[PDB]
Structure formats: C-alpha cells, structure tokens
Amino acid sequence: VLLRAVSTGLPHMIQELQNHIHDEGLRATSNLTQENMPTLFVESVLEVHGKFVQLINTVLNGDQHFMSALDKALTSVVNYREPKSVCKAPELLAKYCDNLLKKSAKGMTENEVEDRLTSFITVFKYIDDKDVFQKFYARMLAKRLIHGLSMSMDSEEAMINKLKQACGYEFTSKLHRMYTDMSVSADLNNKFNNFIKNQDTVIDLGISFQIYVLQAGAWPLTQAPSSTFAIPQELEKSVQMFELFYSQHFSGRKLTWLHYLCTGEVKMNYLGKPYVAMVTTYQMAVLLAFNNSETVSYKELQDSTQMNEKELTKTIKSLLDVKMINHDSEKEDIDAESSFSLNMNFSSKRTKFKITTSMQKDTPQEMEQTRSAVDEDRKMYLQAAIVRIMKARKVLRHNALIQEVISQSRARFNPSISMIKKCIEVLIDKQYIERSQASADEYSYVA
Amino acid sequence: AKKKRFEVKKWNAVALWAWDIVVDNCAICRNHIMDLCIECQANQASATSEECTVAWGVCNHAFHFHCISRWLKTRQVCPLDNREWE
Numbered sequence: 449v450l451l452r453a454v455s456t457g458l459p460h461m462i463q464e465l466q467n468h469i470h471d472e473g474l475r476a477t478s479n480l481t482q483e484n485m486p487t488l489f490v491e492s493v494l495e496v497h498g499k500f501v502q503l504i505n506t507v508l509n510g511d512q513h514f515m516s517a518l519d520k521a522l523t524s525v526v527n528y529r530e531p532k533s534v535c536k537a538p539e540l541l542a543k544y545c546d547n548l549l550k551k552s553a554k555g556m557t558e559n560e561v562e563d564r565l566t567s568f569i570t571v572f573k574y575i576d577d578k579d580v581f582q583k584f585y586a587r588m589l590a591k592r593l594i595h596g597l598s599m600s601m602d603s604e605e606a607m608i609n610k611l612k613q614a615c616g617y618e619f620t621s622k623l624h625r626m627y628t629d630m631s632v633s634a635d636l637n638n639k640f641n642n643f644i645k646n647q648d649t650v651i652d653l654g655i656s657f658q659i660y661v662l663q664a665g666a667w668p669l670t671q672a673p674s675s676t677f678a679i680p681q682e683l684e685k686s687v688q689m690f691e692l693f694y695s696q697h698f699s700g701r702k703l704t705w706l707h708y709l710c711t712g713e714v715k716m717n718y719l720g721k722p723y724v725a726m727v728t729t730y731q732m733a734v735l736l737a738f739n740n741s742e743t744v745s746y747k748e749l750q751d752s753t754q755m756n757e758k759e760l761t762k763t764i765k766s767l768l769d770v771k772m773i774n775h776d777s778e779k780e781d782i783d784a785e786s787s788f789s790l791n792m793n794f795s796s797k798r799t800k801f802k803i804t805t806s807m808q809k810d811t812p813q814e815m816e817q818t819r820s821a822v823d824e825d826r827k828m829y830l831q832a833a834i835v836r837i838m839k840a841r842k843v844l845r846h847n848a849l850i851q852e853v854i855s856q857s858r859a860r861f862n863p864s865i866s867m868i869k870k871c872i873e874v875l876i877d878k879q880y881i882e883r884s885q886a887s888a889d890e891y892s893y894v895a
Numbered sequence: 896a897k898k899k900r901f902e903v904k905k906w907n908a909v910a911l912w913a914w915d916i917v918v919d920n921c922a923i924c925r926n927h928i929m930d931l932c933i934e935c936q937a938n939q940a941s942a943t944s945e946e947c948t949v950a951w952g953v954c955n956h957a958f959h960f961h962c963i964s965r966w967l968k969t970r971q972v973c974p975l976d977n978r979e980w981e
Binding site: 633637655656657661663679680682686687690691695697702703704709710715718721724799871880 | 899900903904907908910911915916921922923926932933935969970975
C-alpha cells in the first residue's frame with residue numbers, strides 16, 4: 449500500500465524483490481537440481497517459475513516495479529546458470545525436450561505436453577542462448593526424426609512456428625524444407641518407383657530409400673561414417689535413377705552417401721533361423737563385413753576396414769547378447785584373437801526382433817560435438833575484437849597488421865599465419881576496412 | 896523369417912542432391928560469397944530474398960557484379976582473383 453503509493457517507498461521493495469528473485473531462482477532451479485538431469489533441472493525451473501508468478505498474483509498484484517524486479521532477476525537466473533555456457537541450459541531442456549518430443553517418452557496429449565513446452569518457451573523468450581541451442585536441439589530432433597522419437601511431426605512443426613514467432617528465425621525455415629524434403633524424399637523414391645517400375649533396369653532392387661540433399665550447408669543430420677562398399681546393384685540404381693529425376697530437379701547437392709540412415713538387412717536370407725533381426729547403421733555395415741567368411745579375424749576384416757571400430761563392438765555385443773554371433777570378442781572391432789560367425793540364437797520377444805539396439809551412445813561423442821561450438825564462439829569474439837581494432841587503427845597493413853593482431857591477443861591461442869590475408873578480407877567485406885592502392889599489404893581503413 | 900540363404904531383403908542407402916557455382920566470394924568483403932559480402936551482408940537492404948542476389952560464372956568464376964565493378968572503377972584490373980565483372 450504505502451511503499452508502492454510512497455513512490456520512493458517502492459525502490460527498497462523492488463531491490464529486495466529482485467534480490468530474492470535471482471536468489472530463489474538459483475536456489476530452487478540451479479541449487480535444487482542435483483542430478484543435473486533436465487528432468488530435475490527443468491522441474492526446478494518450473495518450481496521457480498510457478499513460485500514467482502503466483503507470488504506476484506498475490507498482494508504483489510502487479511506494480512510493474514515489482515514486475516520489473518521479477519522479470520529482471522528472472523532472466524538473470526535464465527542466463528546465469530552455474531555452467532556459464534547457459535546455452536546448454538535450454539539444451540538441457542532440449543534434452544528434456546528430447547524427452548518432450550520423443551514418441552517413446554510417454555503417451556500423452558496435444559498440449560498435455562505442448563503446454564508444458566509452452567511455459568518452457570515462455571521462459572525461453574528470456575533466453576539469448578538460442579543459436580547454439582538451435583544447432584544442438586535441431587540436431588537432436590533431426591536424429592529423433594531419423595530415430596523415430598519425434599513425438600509429433602505437425603505438433604512440433606506448429607510449435608516451432610510459434611518459436612520463430614519469438615525464437616530462432618530461419619533455422620525454422622530450414623527444418624520446414626527438411627520436413628517437406630524427406631516427405632517427398634519418400635514420395636520421389638516412390639516416383640522413381642513410379643517410373644522405376646518400368647522393367648528396364650531395375651529387377652528386384654528395393655534395398656533402401658534414405659535420402660536428403662547432399663551436404664554443403666549446416667544441417668542437423670549427417671551420413672554417419674562409412675567407406676567403400678559393394679552397395680549392391682540396386683543401391684547403384686537408387687542413387688543413379690534418383691539422380692535422373694533429381695539432376696532433372698537439382699544439381700550440386702545430389703545423392704551423396706550417409707550411413708546413419710542405414711539399418712540392418714538380415715532376414716530370410718537363407719537361414720535355419722526364421723529370423724529378421726534388423727540392426728543399426730554400422731551394425732549393418734560391419735555385419736556386411738562378416739557375411740560369407742564363416743569366421744574372420746581382426747586381420748580379415750582389417751583388410752577392407754578403411755573406417756573406425758565402435759561399429760563392430762556394437763556388432764559383436766548385440767550379436768552375442770542375442771546370440772546372433774558365434775564370435776570371439778565383443779571388442780571395438782575384434783581381437784586378432786577373435787573372429788565372427790553368424791550364430792542362430794536370439795534373445796528377445798519375436799522372431800529375432802528387438803535386436804535393433806545401437807548402444808545409441810555418444811559421453812565420448814558428447815565431447816566431439818562440443819568441439820564445434822569452440823570454433824564458432826571464438827570466431828564471433830574475434831570478429832568483434834578485430835573490427836574494433838580495425839576502426840581504431842587502420843592496420844592498415846596486411847602483414848604488419850596481422851602481426852600486431854597477433855601481438856594484441858598473445859594469450860588467446862595460436863592463429864594461422866596465412867588466413868592473415870583472409871582476415872583483412874573478412875573486414876574488407878563489412879565496409880569495416882578497405883583495401884588501399886599502395887600494397888597487397890598496407891591497406892586503408894574505411895567507414 | 897530368415898536372413899541366411901543369400902537373401903537381399905529391404906536394405907537401402909542414402910541419396911542426396913547439391914550444386915556447382917561458388918561464385919568466388921565477391922572480393923569487396925571478408926564474408927561468404929553467396930551469404931553475400933560483409934558490406935552487403937551488413938547492408939540488409941531491399942532485394943528478393945534467396946537467389947535474387949546470387950549470379951553466374953561462365954568460366955566457373957565471378958564476383959558480385961559490383962565487387963569486381965568497384966575495383967574495375969578504381970583499377971581496371973579485376974579486384975582480387977581475376978574473376979567475372981559480375
């Protein structure tokens with residue numbers, strides 16, 4: 449009553465407000481989440497959210513002063529999580545959103561889930577950390593697209609419509625074209641089949657139909673690792689007749705190769721097993737590596753490896769656990785001590801079904817992908833430090849300039865001596881600094 | 896129900912499609928050629944919005960028309976890479 453009505457009364461109020469707001473944020477979201485899981489993380493989030501909002505629904509009763517402290521310390525705790533890379537904080541929720549948009553998470557309802565997500569982005573509007581989160585969770589949802597844990601296509605779609613309304617802008621449009629792209633990827637496989645049907649090539653193909661747009665942008669999906677392969681003849685026909693339709697359509701990106709669309713094709717091949725035990729991508733590739741040779745050492749596979757290992761450790765592990773391999777080691781690829789037979793046994797429900805178990809693991813992968821982020825955040829930090837220097841003093845030379853640049857950031861890291869050229873080049877474009885007549889080096893500052 | 900006869904069951908691959916013009920990074924700038932030049936890419940001005948401001952290279956090299964054009968005016972040689980006036 450008074451200290452609001454007393455206008456200078458309020459300032460103590462809003463001060464103590466924002467103090468408690470930030471402190472309670474840290475406490476009941478950062479300090480109360482202790483498994484650090486987006487389950488508990490996001491739930492501590494929602495705890496603080498409801499606490500502050502409801503608390504203001506009370507005697508607070510508005511007083512945008514009070515709302516001022518509310519929103520201020522709210523977004524403070526928003527971007528002031530303990531791990532200073534707070535962009536993974538939404539990415540935490542992204543992981544949670546991974547849960548939140550993975551079909552196998554739970555059976556739920558339109559806006560049963562989506563409204564929880566709603567309040568999530570309700571606060572995400574307080575988030576500046578998107579772009580990395582953009583990349584991250586676009587990647588995760590693109591996977592789950594691949595991997596089926598896309599809890600709803602159109603639901604997620606309208607969700608990100610609403611997002612771009614208040615979130616990232618054109619990554620949205622990216623993934624829109626992605627959606628339509630893979631949809632009619634199926635459909636154009638179907639057309640190839642519509643005109644691939646005309647028996648002129650193409651007898652008893654039908655091996656796969658995984659399909660996108662030939663890397664050379666920045667997407668959340670890669671042809672996972674792979675190398676030379678036999679790719680039987682129908683796979684030839686697929687890439688080539690698609691390229692018929694598609695070089696008709698588009699050229700420059702084309703039928704590239706991408707393993708992680710691969711899955712297992714081990715079925716009524718000729719098996720005493722009545723069994724169809726599909727496997728993951730390099731499960732497929734490395735089981736392909738062990739088909740006819742009824743046993744194979746580390747050296748026999750090592751002949752035509754030209755790849756990495758973990759593919760085959762997943763291979764032998766899933767093959768022994770189900771008992772589909774008469775192996776010798778479940779190791780990364782195999783012991784030279786160890787080898788490979790197709791065992792007949794199976795351990796799960798159906799006619800050897802649910803062996804499709806990629807381990808589906810990253811900790812070592814989590815770090816590998818964290819590496820990409822260092823390069824883009826260092827580059828941004830540098831663009832600003834570079835333009836600011838370039839405005840201050842016009843060096844500006846090429847060679848001496850780059851050396852001086854080196855001098856200014858001795859502490860940071862070791863740069864490329866070359867690319868010195870490119871460096872000035874980068875500033876030449878922005879209208880930040882120009883190229884003088886005097887030398888290939890030694891240019892001038894503009895603007 | 897089997898996969899051990901020499902059978903080819905449903906087993907597929909991954910197709911893709913991309914193209915083949917650069918178009919050699921519009922020498923005015925230090926940004927990407929087609930995510931256009933740092934001057935233009937800080938302009939944020941009027942134009943049609945995806946391919947309106949991408950162009951050709953008959954040799955498989957060009958610039959922005961104006962990048963090479965500005966150097967041409969300042970110096971009738973090509974700006975950086977001996978590329979298309981375009």
